[PDB]
Design a protein around this ligand. Sequence first.
Ligand SMILES: COC(=O)[C@@H](NC(=O)[C@@H](NC(=O)[C@H](C)N1CCC([C@H](C)NC(=O)[C@H](C)N)=C[C@@H](Cc2ccccc2)C1)C(C)C)C(C)C
Lengths: 99, 99
Amino acid sequence: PQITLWQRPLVTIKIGGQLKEALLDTGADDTVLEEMSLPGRWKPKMIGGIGGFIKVRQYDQILIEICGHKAIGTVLVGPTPVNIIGRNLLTQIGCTLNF
Amino acid sequence: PQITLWQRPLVTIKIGGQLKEALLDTGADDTVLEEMSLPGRWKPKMIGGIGGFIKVRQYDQILIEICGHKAIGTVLVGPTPVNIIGRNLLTQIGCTLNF
Ligand SMILES: COC(=O)[C@@H](NC(=O)[C@@H](NC(=O)[C@H](C)N1CCC([C@H](C)NC(=O)[C@H](C)N)=C[C@@H](Cc2ccccc2)C1)C(C)C)C(C)C
């Protein structure tokens, strides 16, 4: 769809059996999601952001359905305020920026 | 133009007679630039990102030329890593998300 930006660009995702709303973020390289129950093994990592750095669990090859399109990639689960869908997955569902 | 997302969406802005480069961020509600010499009166404000909170100087009514397009808005200048063009200016240059 075409999404104008007079409101936050949130979209429903289906991840690990659960339904969530995540923000479409072109300024984020990675997908970072708030703490939730995910199947499997993971590696600790520390991602940087504007207020500093947070420690996250890294899950690779996690299937996620962003507004009906399916994608498989790495998801970082941690202390994020909002669920962030970053550029490693937006490229997969074919998303572009236009002006 | 149309921007795909395999690389960061960085564009050239002209602000306060200085040439800068900045991230086109759909996920940010506000625009926040690195520390710079800018004339005027500003107000103390503090914003959040992941990792936490930074104190910034907010300035209203500043002209920014984002890839040639002129826009007048609120710009926050402070200790950010990258310069971020958030939704208050992105709606002015007509930017939309497509997929
Ligand atoms: C560096 O690796 C990454 O890709 C990280 N990327 C970033 O932090 C990048 N920035 C962003 O994604 C943008 C600017 N953004 C940060 C500030 C930001 C805006 C400026 N904050 C606000 O408007 C608050 C509500 N006043 C929102 C972030 C999402 C969010 C929402 C609510 C509370 C906290 C965070 C998203 C830059 C620093 C490379 C991910 C952790 C998101």
